[PDB]
Structures are given as C-alpha cells and as structure tokens.
Design a protein around this ligand. Structure first.
Ligand SMILES: CC(C)(C)OC(=O)N[C@H]1CNc2ccccc2C1
Ligand SMILES: CC(C)(C)OC(=O)N[C@H]1CNc2ccccc2C1
Ligand SMILES: [Mg+2]
Ligand SMILES: [Mg+2]
Lengths: 546, 546
C-alpha cells in the first residue's frame, strides 16, 4: 500500500535542528525562555521568517530583521540583550553544527532500495552568508540519495500551508495514503494527516525508525552495515583527453580539491572504483578515475609497444599537461599499481603522493631476465600464457559474461586455479560455462564490464603483459633511486597471486612507506572490501596528501 | 636556412639561474669564492651532480652528497661552514626564486609562430623535495610553448656530452646548420658549434635576442605586445554531463583550484573564452568553459521552454551536482551574463562569486510586460525579429561563414546596424555576401564556429530569446532580494547594444558590486580586448573569490 517516504531536513535528516540552537542559546545566555523562538516567529504568516522561507528575501537580508524582532521582544519582556548579541554568530554556529543523521539517511536509502519514491521536503532559505558553502555541501551529500528535493524557498510555499502538500502529492505522483511523511514539528504533520498520509512525529531517531519499520513492514533499524555509495555510469561526468594523435584517454570525474587519479588493473575499468569515487569526493578530493590505455572508452591501438611502462607513463604525464594539472595523487591496483610506482620513480614532480593496492614495488633484477624471474614462480604461470598474441585474446573474448563472472570472485568463491595454466591450455579449462554470481557483484554490474569489453576486447589489455624485456631495461635506469615522496601500500590477506609477503622488502626502496592491510580480502580489493579501502585511503590522503 | 631554435631553461628561459645562487650565497655568507661551485662539480663526469643530472639519483638523495662535498671543500680550503649551513634551504630558495624570462619565451613564441621548430634542452634533475610542485608548475607553463622538451634526467645524457646534441639533432629532424642553440654556459655551446650550429652565448637577455634577431632575420625585440595564449580545441580536455534524459552539457576544462564556470553569449561557444582559458588556469583556477544548452556539443532540444531562465538555471545546478561541486564562480557574457545574475539570485549557495561582461543586472518591471519594455528601445528591435520561430533561423543558417564574419567585428569595423531590423526584413539585408575578416579573428577561428553550428544551427540558441514572458514571471519572484555575494560587472565602452549606462543603477540591487571598464571595446569583449579582460578577472578572483 505505502510507496513513498518524505523526510524533512531540520530535525529529521540533519541534527541538531537549528530551532534547537534557539533554545540552547537562550539557556546558554540565561535569556527569557522562548524569547528567541518568539523573535523567530514574529508576525507569523506575514513576518520576516515566512518571507525568508518563501524565497522572498535572502538569509543575509533576514538577519537584521530578526535582530529587530529580538530587540522588540527583549523590550516587551523588559530584559536587556547581552553586549555582543549576534544573530549572525548564533546562526553561523548552529548551521555548521548540524550533520547528516546517519541512521535516518540509511533508512531512507534502504526504502529507496526496496522500491519507494523518496523525497526531502523542507522549509529553507536562500543562503548568501560568507559561510554558505557549508550548507551547499550538506545539501549535495543528501540530495543525491532522494528522488526529489522540494525547498520552501524554491517553490514559494511553506509547511504547514496546505498547498505545499498538494505540490508534494503532485511531485510524487502518488495519493496521500501511499505516503509516509516524517517531521519533528507536529504542526507540519497536521496537514499531512488531514489528507490521510501516515505521519511520524520524529523525536528520537530510533523510535521514529521503529514506527517507520512497523508501518512499511521493512527492516530499517539494526540492519547490516550497507555498502558505500556506488556510481551510476550515466550520472557521471565523462572526460576525454587526446594525449597524442592515435590515442585518447577517458575518465570519470567527481569532487573538488587535490586531484586524485585512480588507475584500475587487468582486466578492469574506471568502474572498478565505483565504491571509492563518491567517498573520496565526499572526503574533499577531485577524483579522476581512468580507463587506462587499451580499455573501455580509451583508445586501444593494436601495437604491443604502445603498452610498455615508459609509453604508458609519458602518456599519463601528458594527461596532466593537457588537463592543466601540475601534480596528482596516483592510486593504483594491480597493473595500475605497477604504473604508479613507476610514475613516482620517473616523474616525482608530478606525483603528489603514491599508493598501491596489492601490487608491491619490486625493482628489476639487473642480473636476471624478467621472463626467467617469472618461470621461477609457479603462481605467475598465467603471465606466460599471455605472451602469444591471439591465444588469451581468443579464450577471454569467447564469452564475456563467463570471463568476468569467473574472474571477479571473493577469496572463498574461486573457480580457476592459476596453477599450470599453460599446461591446462587455458584459464577456464577447468571452470564452468555458467558460473554463479559472486556475492561481490550484481548481474547488472557484470554486464557493464561485458559491454565495455565489446569495444576493444583484450588485445590492448593483454599487451600490458607483453613488454617484459622492454620494461626491464627501462626499470634498470631507476635502480639507483629511492621513492621519498609520500607512499602507501595496501596488502590483501587473501590475494593468492599478489601476496602480502611479496611486499616485505619495500621499505629498502621506500624508507618512509606507510601500510594498510585488509583481512579476508582476495584480489579484487575495491569491490571485495569497499568500506575498509575507503577508510584506509581517506585516512592516508588526509594525513599525507593535503 | 635556419629552421629550429633550442633554448636552455636555467639562465635562458628562466632567471635567475640556480648556479647563480651558488655565487650569491657565497658572497651573502662571506665564504671562499667558488667554494659552492667547487662542491657542486666535484668528481666531474663521475661526481654526484652528474649522476643527478643523468637521472641516476633523485634530488633528495643528492642533497646529502653535496653536503659531503661542501664539508670536504671547506676542509681543504681550511674554513668552517656556518652554523646552520643548509643545502636544502639554499636550493628550495634558489628554485622558487627562478621565474620565466618573459622576453625569451616571447621570442621563442614568435619564432615558433613564423615556422620554427622550437625546443627546451636542459640539464635537470628528478625533483622529489616536499616543494617540488613549484618546478612542476614552471615546467608546465613553459613546455606547452615548445615542440620538444628534452631533459637530461629523462634521457640519461647531459650537456656538454656530444651525444645529447646528436639526440637533439635527431629529435628535431634537422641538420646542425638549420639550428640556433642558446645557452648561458660556454662549455655547452662548444659541441653545438663543433657540429656547425649557430650558437648564442646568453649573458643579458636583450643582447642575446639581438644576435637571435640578426641571425634569423625575424623581429623579436621591441615587437608589439602579443595576444594571450589561445586554446587548441583538440588539445583540450572535453567533458560531458547528462543533466536529465534528453539533455547533456559539454564543457572544456583546464587547471586546478577554485572551480570557475564560464558562460558564453549568443550566438557563440566555449571557444569564445579561448583567451581566458589558459590565463585563469595559469592564475590558479579550475576553468570550466561551457557549451551552453543549445550550442556546439551540448544538446539542443527543439522546444522553446527548454530554454527559459529557470530551466537553464536548474540545469546548471544539476551540472554542479553531478560533477560533485558545491559552488563555482560564475562568469558570463551577454546571454550567459544574464544567466549568472539569475544564478546568484536563486542559487547563491552554489555561486562562490558572480561576474558579467557587458550584461547589466536589470530587474523585471512588475508593471510592464517585457515585450513592451523591449519596444520602448530602438536598439533592441532585433529581439523582436527573433520571436517568430523560423524567420531568424533561416537567415542565420543560410550562410554560416557569412553570419559569423558579419557578427564578430571590432567597434570600428561594423557592417550591420541593429536599426529597425524588423522593417529591413533581416539582420544582414544591408551587409556583404563576402565580408572581410575582422582583425579580431583568423580564418581558422571563423571555421571553428561554422563547424559547431552545423550540428544544431540556431533554433536552440534563438529560443533563449523566446521566453520573454516566462522569464518575467519568474524574475518577479526575486524582486525582494538583493545580490550580496561577491559580484563584478564589466562594461565595454563601445558595445552599442549593451551600453555602459545600462549598468548604472546596479548598485541598488548589489550594494557591494565591483566594476571594471574596458575602453575601445565593442560587444565581443573576450576576443576584442583579451589582455584587459584577463587582467580584470584575475585581479577580482584573487581578491574576492579565494
Ligand atoms: C601485472 C601484475 C604482476 C601486477 O599482476 C597481475 O597479473 N594481475 C592480475 C590481473 N587479474 C588477473 C586475471 C587473470 C589471471 C591473472 C590475473 C592477475
Ligand atoms: C540577451 C541580451 C539582452 C543580454 O543581449 C543580446 O541580445 N546579446 C547580443 C547577442 N549578439 C547579437 C547578435 C546579433 C544581434 C544582436 C545581438 C545582441
Ligand atoms: Mg523541522
Ligand atoms: Mg645553464
């Protein structure tokens, strides 16, 4: 029956409410109880506050008017206002004190996820204070999670006026009895209740959620901890830069602040960073998530040398050049992890900080050809399988669905052993035609990859593996150097290819290296343990890159 | 005969040279003359400095080694190093003290513009100091103006080693006698001279330019003041954001720092901001230069209401939302100028600062229908001509070349009077089939516009003019408000449509408004007086938006 949930901001999605700082100030300053609410509501329907809420005047025009009301209120109750009494002060303070009420937002998210149309309906103001950016930020973080945001000041109406509820109903394309409406102010429920909406008086969040959980029959409180926000591809800003004639790079871009460049592994996509993208934007960064050369919407020229580390690096430099960026933070996974270490090593003036998931920094052995180094280790046998142009392309392109559903699996879910892949004749010889979905990925998300690899297949991506000798010679040039810019290394307990112990000597080349470690996490780090990854990168960026 | 010019960075394109801070420090600290050069060059071909220049070690690894050399040099000349002697200090200081030598860069630019292949060839280091960003910035600003940058540390060779000159020759695809090579160090000329290159010992810049001007027979010194850097479209990062199902917005993006959103007028393009784009990036900003709805690579849906101010504004808000930006600086010209004022007025939490070229902020007259307001003023008669869908589309699309060559003209160049356009039957009735090129635009630049308007023509752009009544009703909602966020207004002496006196009352609605004024500048402000515009915006951004 119920199909939509409507939330207020002040006192429901963000706490503490500002009306509440009207109370605390009163106590704080031993003013007459209510004096500040009295001043705030003066003249009711025709007073300053209503005009403000209706968009007739801006916050900064309003401040002086509330001063006047406070001056008149204090005169009628025969009390003096304290030397230095500042409405601007009180409100600046109140406004930044208010935060997203995490449980409420999560309840809204849940309900959205089980089918509800959700909305913010709020009495608010046109904010033009010097410190307005605060609220702009909050409102951005909130609005993305809702189907609608309806603001008193944008529509010229306010609660409890019966018409805003009609506008509400109209925007929802629902009928009053399919709506739950939550508010902290009883007056604003009355018109919702009159049309026959379920209404929740929100005092403590938890009890409001109990009523909400009861009346929608969905579990909301005590639910498991949810995944970080994902990206909807077609809601992203997509960016494109030609770095030389036959080669353009695609990326997705979110947030402002220090530029942070995310480099995915083999055989993946910008989409591999879907869980990090909003978190780091949210954390105060300009995330640039790449399609690395050879993938998705980036160019994929056929030649093998187009993919040696050197060419790949100069190309990332040029990407900075044309975007007008003097440095970026480089963060990489797997193959992208190898690339960023090498970026630190040949272009440190352009790297603000460097960080890798799974991929250790290992130097070239000037004594031992890299092909040989690779045969010494059974788990790397698949890298040999990848040498012959055509062979791996054929097997991996033959069924895309199957490929990604076979590769993208948690530690406890595997279907392909990396064991003697050459001998077996393939990566999937001993694995299913129709593998089950990994707990880590939806059907939809598999298709996204599928559709990306339909543009260029696997020739480009596989090439990255086919300059073993060329990268070795180049790598040797850096053997005298050390990495001395900020550097994070994140090991995954259960990557059985890029194992933690492989990273163990890294401190010799990177004396000041920082570490994070993720337990119970296989190879596909970002999607396997998205929460822990975000926690580790944001902490390190805030401390080493800012 | 001469076809290429090669420049060094230290002491030729950037001054003061760092080797020179080795001298000044000596004097400054009353050390033995040369002691610091001695330490710097210790061991020659096999000493620390050569290894550094060759890319064998990074700057931070080198610092301690030069300390050692300085300690050993001071011991052999039997003198003590001053308590607190710091090579890191000296170099941090020296490195940020060095600036682009504007006249040299201009000479290089000129020579490039008359056909030369130009290059930076320099002995430099892999810089990994905490303050490396300085040099990264300098190198970005310089490298864009050259065909090549060849760095000792990237190629493993150094001047005066004869092979770097062979690599040079090879990269130029020129022969030694078509090359002028300028350096401040005589030793590094000797191998250039040996192969038979013209060489210039650069002591004072001016005399070096005289030799350079003499030997290439091009004027370099005393030349007129050049235009700001333009954009090459295909060297830009192009960005694309879907703001709702049938509507995506294109933009071009350059630089980092506060986001600054440029909004072009009618009938123009992001390309209209080609002179501002590098300057503001250079000035420390993230320039986002739009194709406004209806233009170039942005969507151009046919319906008229798709272009009322309201829809246009909510759409720019959404553009911020999806790019993850809480505010941007809004800067507008002409129609884009109208839009930004309205953005300040309905969404000030999202506008960090507002600024318009030519377009005053004028309120709606609640007493007088806007059509009527428009007939009261003869110069606005063309806005009436634009009302009838089809009429203006036909005339403007009939010959694109002709259109833009007729519209884009300096104050002293005009061909169309705006006078009684309706009566005449068109905008071009009394103007040429083949107009001459305006001094403001190259043939190439006209074509760029031409090709842009081939995607959608003029239906979209013209619509902006076709919601007079709708924008009026909406505008009236803001009549109680004032603009109190930072605000710049820039009048063009010789815009005979958007005349300076039209802006004269703006202080009533915008008490703290700031002004700039450009003399001898017609309607096409950005391209007519690009230098003065950049000077005015950068000064105001630095002071009001940062
Ligand atoms: C290049 C380095 C040595 C850094 O790691 C990798 O080979 N990565 C992964 C890529 N996913 C994947 C997929 C199939 C088989 C093996 C792998 C190993
Ligand atoms: C919309 C406002 C009132 C702000 O200004 C304009 O009509 N701009 C210009 C556009 N260029 C142009 C081109 C042809 C004719 C008239 C004009 C006037
Ligand atoms: Mg409330
Ligand atoms: Mg020199």
């Amino acid at each position: 029956t119920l199909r939509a949930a409507v939330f207020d901001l002040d006192g429901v999605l963000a706490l503490p409410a500002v009306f509440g700082v009207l109370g605390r100030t009163e106590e704080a300053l031993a003013l007459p109880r209510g004096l500040l609410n009295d001043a705030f509501q003066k003249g009711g329907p025709e007073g300053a506050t209503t005009r403000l809420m209706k968009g007739e005047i801006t916050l900064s025009q309003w401040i002086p008017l509330m001063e006047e009301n406070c001056r008149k209120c204090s005169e009628t109750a025969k009390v003096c206002l304290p030397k230095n009494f500042s409405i601007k002060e009180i409100f600046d303070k109140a406004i930044s004190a208010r935060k997203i009420n995490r449980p409420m937002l999560q309840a809204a998210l849940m309900l959205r996820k089980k089918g509800f149309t959700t909305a913010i309906l709020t009495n608010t103001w046109l904010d033009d204070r010097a410190e307005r950016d605060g609220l702009a930020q909050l409102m951005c973080e909130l609005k993305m999670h809702f189907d609608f945001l309806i603001e008193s000041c944008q529509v010229g109406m306010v609660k409890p006026e019966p018409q805003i509820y009609k506008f509400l109903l109209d925007t929802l394309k629902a009928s009053p009895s399919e709506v739950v409406f939550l508010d902290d102010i009883g007056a604003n429920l009355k018109p919702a209740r009159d049309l026959g909406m379920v209404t929740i008086l929100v005092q403590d969040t938890d009890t409001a959620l109990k009523e909400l959980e009861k009346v929608t029959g969905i579990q909301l409180l005590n639910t498991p901890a949810p995944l970080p926000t994902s990206c909807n591809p077609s809601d992203m800003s997509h960016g494109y830069v030609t770095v030389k004639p036959r080669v353009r790079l695609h990326f997705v871009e979110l947030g402002s602040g220090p530029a942070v460049c995310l480099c995915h592994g083999f055989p993946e996509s910008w989409y591999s960073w879907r869980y990090q993208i909003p978190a780091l934007a949210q954390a105060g960064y300009r995330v640039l998530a790449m399609d690395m050369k050879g993938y998705g919407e980036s160019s994929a020229p056929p030649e093998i040398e187009e993919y040696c580390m050197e060419v790949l690096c100069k190309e990332m430099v040029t990407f900075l050049d044309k975007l007008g960026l003097s440095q970026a933070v480089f963060i990489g996974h797997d193959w992208g992890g190898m690339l960023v270490w090498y970026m630190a090593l040949f272009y440190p003036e352009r790297v603000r900080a460097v960080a890798s998931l799974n991929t250790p920094f290992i130097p070239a052995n000037p004594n031992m050809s890299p092909l040989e180094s690779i045969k010494a280790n059974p788990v790397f046998d698949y890298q040999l399988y990848f040498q012959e142009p055509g062979v791996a392309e054929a097997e991996l392109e033959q069924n895309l669905s199957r490929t990604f559903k076979s590769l993208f699996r948690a530690s406890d879910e595997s279907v392909l052993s990396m064991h003697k892949v050459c001998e077996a004749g393939g990566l999937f010889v001993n694995s299913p035609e129709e593998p089950s979905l990994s707990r880590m990925v939806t059907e939809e998300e598999i298709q996204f990859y599928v559709q990306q690899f339909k543009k260029s297949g696997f020739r480009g991506p596989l090439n990255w593996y086919r300059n073993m000798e060329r990268n070795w010679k180049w790598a040797c040039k850096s053997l005298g150097r050390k990495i001395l810019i900020p550097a994070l290394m994140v090991t995954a307990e259960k990557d059985f290819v890029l194992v933690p112990q492989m990273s163990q000597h890294m401190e010799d080349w990177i004396p000041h290296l920082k570490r994070g470690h993720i337990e119970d996490c296989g190879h596909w780090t970002q999607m396997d343990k998205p929460t822990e990854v975000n926690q580790i990168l944001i902490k390190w960026l805030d401390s080493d890159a800012r």
